[PDB]
Amino acid sequence: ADRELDKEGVERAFSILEDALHVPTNPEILLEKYKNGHRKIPAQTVLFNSLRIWSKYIDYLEAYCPKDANSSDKIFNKTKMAYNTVIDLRLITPAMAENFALFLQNHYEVMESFQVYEKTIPLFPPEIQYELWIEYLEVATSHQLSSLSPEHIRFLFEKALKNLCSNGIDCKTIFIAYSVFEERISGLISKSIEILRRGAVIRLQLWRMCISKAESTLGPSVTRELYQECIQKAVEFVIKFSDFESSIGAREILAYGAKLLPPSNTELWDSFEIFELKHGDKTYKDMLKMKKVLESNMLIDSASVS
Amino acid sequence: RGGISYDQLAKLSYEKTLRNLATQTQNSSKQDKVQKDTKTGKITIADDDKLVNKLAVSLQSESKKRYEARKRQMQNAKTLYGVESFINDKNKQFNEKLSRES
Amino acid sequence: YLIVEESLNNVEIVRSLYTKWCSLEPGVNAWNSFVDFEIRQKNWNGVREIYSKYVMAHPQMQTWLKWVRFENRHGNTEFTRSVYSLAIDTVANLQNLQIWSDMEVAKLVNSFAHWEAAQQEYERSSALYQIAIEKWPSNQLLKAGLLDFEKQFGDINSIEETISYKRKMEYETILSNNAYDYDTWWLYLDLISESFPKQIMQTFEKAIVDSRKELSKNVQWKRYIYLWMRYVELELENSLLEEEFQRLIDDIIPHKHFTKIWLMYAKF
């Protein structure tokens, strides 16, 4: 192929490489009879299976198609059937599945590139679907030609988000993409229960903390519910987050310092928390010294237990 | 996990011997009726004596192979463990049997 | 008995043995080794006779879908849709016996449709979803498996038509479960105002303002108000404003007939 591409046209380079890729009647039987055949059956018959053959065939097509193809052209109809044949042969790698969906979005075939993500995710195992769902959900919300309804974009998240956390992946971004887009198209703070689910799946502390900042902008009635639910090494970090929420909107915070120190070992960071709560006031270094006195006595009790 | 039932184990032993019979025909190919006596009632089947021989040899070969694969397991497991107190071989095989329980 | 007569290359004795053994209805291990026997012998017409009997001995989709995995392995298109036509009629013919579950019939409808999508006939892929949902309105899995077919092979207005229904059922089942989640109301109404404009569109707005006391609640009524107002309006406005208003009635009398309805709603 490579010597003929320089000497002769790419149409000559296709035609010598078209003869490689005849998918005859049945690839399932020929693939199996080749694998079970002990070196007697030639690989001339099962030559279509080879990924290397398809990728450099396609890369000639995707290079030869013009920058404006718009589906009238023969070649854009030719590279799409050659791309779809790879998916039907099922020998498509996930970087190659992105190269076809990217291929359609440059040539304004955006609404058919959502079919491209749709066909392939089923075929792949998770830990790889997470990289396709980023590129699929981002085209749905960011690309300008995609006019999808806000109940259709919400379908694409909560079909993925439910499916993808079911097999078990951290899913930090998809939660945020379903969190960020909710203001740009809908514009209400339903964001919290959409993002609470990140904190309570069945990193996670870094999803819980940024959003409990966000409802202190909107309204304190839905902050204080999170401050309760935030606390129910990692446990100690959750207690610290609760103390910060109390400072934003003090006795509940000090008692929380007790609840957290009693949550778990060391507790000096909690001392920094109560000290922060004391420092926040613009009252008497009496309750503070009493607090350090109570903490020290608790430490002495822990030493007695040990 | 868990064990395999006898109907499943009989199928897998069925499938394994077919692959031994497949490669036996492949290794052969690489190198190169019914009569019912009406008076007695008996049925007679004419078959190749080579295939009866290859049936008889393979069963003896599988019998010796399992006999040797167990014999080495007898010689290994006798010379593995000597920590817990024993008296004879039947004590050793019993207290090892207590170890598989827990 | 089999692997000895296999070893003797007596192919007519294992065939006579298997015909007897599959007559006593033993289980799926026997039949699957009997369809694997004829693949060895290349008897393609004989193994097709077995699956005719194998679906009658074990009526279940993993025996029917095994027979379509046989036919799609060989690529014979005339034989595969004949099996597909026999599989979906027998579910319809034997509906009252109740031996295939809702998740079980969804595997047959989807594997019929995704095969017809690969056979480039999308109008047969599309129409069978309608007959299956009507033929079975009970199973949600066949309705939900209808949607994923449109996502892959359908044109965009058809997906949005079907998407609007699944969102309708899922918003309906949360609000029946969860009592006062006011943020799902403000989308469920806007689900029906956007894509379900009809008698239902007015009706839910009644059914919402039924559910409407919080600060979190009452602004939903404000939405239903203008939703009514954009399109009576005074009559429902007085009924809701009755929550309590002596200053309001004195404010009402001075600027109801004098100035508008928008002035009337300003009091509320």
Curated annotation (Swiss-Prot), chain A:
In which compartments does the protein localize? Nucleus
In this chain the HAT repeats are located at 29-63, 108-142, 148-184, 194-216, 218-247, 249-278
Regarding protein family, the annotation reads: Belongs to the crooked-neck family.
Q: What exactly does this protein do?
A: Involved in pre-mRNA splicing and cell cycle control. As a component of the NTC complex (or PRP19-associated complex), associates to the spliceosome to mediate conformational rearrangement or to stabilize the structure of the spliceosome after U4 snRNA dissociation, which leads to spliceosome maturation.
Under the subunit heading, UniProt states: Belongs to the NTC complex (or PRP19-associated complex), composed of at least CEF1, CLF1, ISY1, NTC20, SNT309, SYF1, SYF2, and PRP19.
Miscellaneous comment in the UniProt entry for this protein: Present with 2170 molecules/cell in log phase SD medium.
Q: What is this protein called?
A: Pre-mRNA-splicing factor SYF1
Species this protein is from: Saccharomyces cerevisiae (strain ATCC 204508 / S288c) (Baker's yeast)
From Swiss-Prot, chain B:
Please give the name of this protein: Pre-mRNA-splicing factor SYF2
Q: What does the UniProt record say this protein does?
A: Involved in pre-mRNA splicing and cell cycle control. As a component of the NTC complex (or PRP19-associated complex), associates to the spliceosome to mediate conformational rearrangement or to stabilize the structure of the spliceosome after U4 snRNA dissociation, which leads to spliceosome maturation. The cell cycle arrest of SYF2 defective cells may be due to the inefficient splicing of TUB1.
Its annotated compartments are: Nucleus
Question: Biological process (GO) annotations?
Answer: mRNA splicing, via spliceosome
Report the sequence similarity comment from the record: Belongs to the SYF2 family.
Q: How does it assemble?
A: Belongs to the NTC complex (or PRP19-associated complex), composed of at least CEF1, CLF1, ISY1, NTC20, SNT309, SYF1, SYF2, and PRP19.
Q: Which UniProt keywords apply?
A: mRNA processing, mRNA splicing, Nucleus, Phosphoprotein, Spliceosome
Which stretches are tagged as biased composition: Polar residues? 20-32
Miscellaneous information on this protein: Present with 1670 molecules/cell in log phase SD medium.
Kindly list the GO CC terms recorded for this protein: cytosol; nucleus; Prp19 complex; U2-type catalytic step 1 spliceosome; U2-type catalytic step 2 spliceosome; U2-type post-mRNA release spliceosomal complex; U2-type prespliceosome
Swiss-Prot record, chain C:
Further comment: Present with 2140 molecules/cell in log phase SD medium.
Q: What is this protein called?
A: Pre-mRNA-splicing factor CLF1
Q: Where are the HAT repeats?
A: 9-40, 42-73, 75-109, 113-145, 162-194, 199-230, 241-268
What exactly does this protein do? Involved in pre-mRNA splicing and cell cycle progression. Required for the spliceosome assembly by promoting the functional integration of the U4/U6.U5 tri-snRNP particle into the U1-, U2-dependent pre-spliceosome. Also recruits PRP19 to the spliceosome, as a component of the NTC complex (or PRP19-associated complex). The association of the NTC complex to the spliceosome mediates conformational rearrangement or stabilizes the structure of the spliceosome after U4 snRNA dissociation, which leads to spliceosome maturation.
Where in the cell is the protein located?
Nucleus
Q: Which domain of life is it from?
A: Eukaryota
This protein's encoding gene: CLF1
Q: How does it assemble?
A: Belongs to the NTC complex (or PRP19-associated complex), composed of at least CEF1, CLF1, ISY1, NTC20, SNT309, SYF1, SYF2, and PRP19.
Q: Which family does it belong to?
A: Belongs to the crooked-neck family.
Q: Which span of the entire protein is present here?
A: 139 to 413 of 687
Question: TM segments?
Answer: none
Q: Species name for this entry?
A: Saccharomyces cerevisiae (strain ATCC 204508 / S288c)
